[PDB]
Each structure stands twice: as C-alpha cells, then as structure tokens.
C-alpha cells in the first residue's frame, strides 16, 4: 500500500465537506505513486459512486495498486507493434499506439510525454517501459 499519512494529508487538503470526487481520487492516487486506469475509475463509480469519504478513497486507492504490473507484459505489448523487430519504435509508431489503442492519450498528454521521455525516432520501448514503471 501507499504511504498512509501522505494519503490522509492529500485527501484532507483536496476534500470539500470531507469528500473528494473520483476525478480527484484519480489525481491523488497518481500523486501517491499509483497508476489507476480510467476503467478503474468507472468500475469504482459503478460500485461506490463518484463522491468518496476517506474510507472509500482508501478503498479506491486499494483497487489502483495493480501489483500484477510487470515490465515484461508492458515491453511485449509494444513489441507486438514492432513489425520488423527492430527493438525500437519510431515517434510515429509510439504516437499511433498510445493515441489510438487502450485508453488513448490526448495530444496534450502525448506532446508532454514526448518532450520529457522521448529522445529520437528510435525509442527503446524496453527502457521506456522501465522508466514508466519506476
């Protein structure tokens, strides 16, 4: 689990009337070091609504831990699109994957991502996935 007093501090600072929206719960979870998906958000909303007291926030953070995350599963997801098995993907290829499939990045998100974490037209997706899991 995340760091409990940080979880409490961030919730209390974001809360209004002792509650935070699931939208804010998503942000705080990320700040706490987790990677909730939008599917996690929708799943939780259908289960517990979109306005969380601290107990329900703790539970949401719980469902967002994804201990099953593994570098090999991520690396091989990108490898699938490495048609010619180069061991890298171009900016185009990375962009097309990340903005078309799954829970697609917005151009805002992708442009920020590319600025910091991309380095060329030969993105080593193994090392990129390592960085993302860090």
């Amino acid at each position: 689990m995340v760091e409990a007093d940080e979880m409490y501090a961030r919730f209390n600072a974001r809360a209004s009337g002792g509650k935070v929206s699931t939208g804010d719960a998503m942000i705080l979870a990320r700040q706490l070091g987790l990677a909730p998906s939008y599917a996690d958000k929708q799943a939780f909303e259908e289960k517990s609504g979109d306005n969380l007291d601290y107990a329900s926030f703790q539970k949401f953070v719980g469902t967002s831990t994804h201990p099953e995350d593994n570098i090999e599963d991520l690396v091989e997801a990108f490898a699938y699109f490495d048609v010619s098995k180069h061991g890298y993907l171009t900016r185009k290829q990375m962009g097309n994957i990340l903005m078309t499939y799954g829970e697609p990045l917005t151009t805002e998100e992708f442009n920020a991502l590319a600025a910091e974490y991309f380095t060329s037209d030969q993105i080593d997706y193994r090392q990129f996935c390592k960085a993302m899991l860090e």
Binding site: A35, H66, L74, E76, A77, G102, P104, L133
Partner: peptide
C-alpha cells in the same frame, strides 16, 4: 490481448504526467 497492457502503460504514463496538468478526467476507450 495486448490492449490491457497498453492501458497499464498509459496509466503509468499518466502517473508520471500528474504534475503536468494535462490529463483529462475521462477518456473514451478504444
């Protein structure tokens, strides 16, 4: 069967962009 892991990659991307104020509240999945 790769899509669930693309989503995990995208979730971890968003985790690292949290201070960038760029991520939407909702995303239309594909």
């Amino acid at each position: 069967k790769k899509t669930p892991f693309i989503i995990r990659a995208q979730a971890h991307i968003r985790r690292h962009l949290v201070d960038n104020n760029v991520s939407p509240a909702t995303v239309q999945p594909a």
